[PDB]
Amino acid sequence: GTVNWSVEDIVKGINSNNLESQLQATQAARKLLSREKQPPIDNIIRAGLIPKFVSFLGKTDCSPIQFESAWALTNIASGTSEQTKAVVDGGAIPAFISLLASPHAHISEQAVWALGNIAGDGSAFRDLVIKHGAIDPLLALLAVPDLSTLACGYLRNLTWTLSNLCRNKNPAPPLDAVEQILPTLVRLLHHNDPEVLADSCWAISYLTDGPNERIEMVVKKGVVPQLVKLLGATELPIVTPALRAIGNIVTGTDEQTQKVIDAGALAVFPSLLTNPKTNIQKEATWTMSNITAGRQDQIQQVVNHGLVPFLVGVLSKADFKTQKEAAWAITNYTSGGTVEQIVYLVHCGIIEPLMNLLSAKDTKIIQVILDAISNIFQAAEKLGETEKLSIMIEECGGLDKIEALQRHENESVYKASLNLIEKYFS
């Protein structure tokens, strides 16, 4: 009969001098806080119950009240930043870290969960959890010869909490903390549970979202081939973070991008660039745009894998944001590519969709497309085929679009368009 208690009754029980009455009331609070219909978190906080729960976390010889208070506090910490803050202000971080070593698995797991919510609030609470020394006991829980001997839910909660310890920026997690976490993270990235894999990929995607030194920390552990494998996974919750991480990595140096290419990533992009999930297509086209910004041999690898027709396709038809990413990929390709590669791009049919996209209201995409067209015209000049390109552009209706752009609000736009008209359409 710990169901549908009032906050007043919970308070009466917790303020009793009776450990069992306190346990009953704490379980009643846990049940109140574990309902999907507007859990009365703020009422529980206003009642002043957080410090009592925290003190209960330390009652070693009453493991039930440890568990019930840990669960109640976990659900409080799962709410707004102010509610998580109320939990932290009650002294919960060191108590939960001390619980991580509990001989009862459900209590240690609940402490893992609570620390995950706290760390996931933001960079400050993440770093505060780290300062209290959570990483060592967390990783100690995972120091087993074979991860398959752990309970599935326990392992999933550990992975999610570690991922939250890798999450958030301004600042990014401490470098020493990342180095301490990464080996276990790679081990988890090779685990066979789909949720563990998804959360490990999210962690890696966080760690690779930053300067090239962070990307290097990750790539040095040799995870790129496993990331490409997971990029081939059937589960969207795995592919999404895998692709996000690969994109992050190819925002780095040409050597890191080359590690992505060598692992076989481009072979997956025919499907990714046609994926029915809009976000997958957009992220894959963004990754392609940063690969085409690389060296000429890397552009050539893009060509060899047959991805230029897929870029033409996405430019021809896709969500407008994906089309913007595709236009950027084309501009990078044309800015860095050889004359032969640019000619090949034209032979694949880039001109007509590129010109069709010059009717968009977005100014940035117009600038991008005009720069790409200028680069293609420069290649044609180097081949002395500018007249052929001008005729092609005129046949698809692009000359009309550029002439109209000559009188466009933005400045760079009309300047570039007038330059094109004067230089190649006289």
Binding site: S34, T74, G116, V250, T251, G336
Partner: peptide
């Protein structure tokens, strides 16, 4: 050229 560009309750 290159462009750099949670919580869970129980029950």
């Amino acid at each position: 050229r290159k462009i750099k560009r949670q919580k869970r309750g129980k029950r």
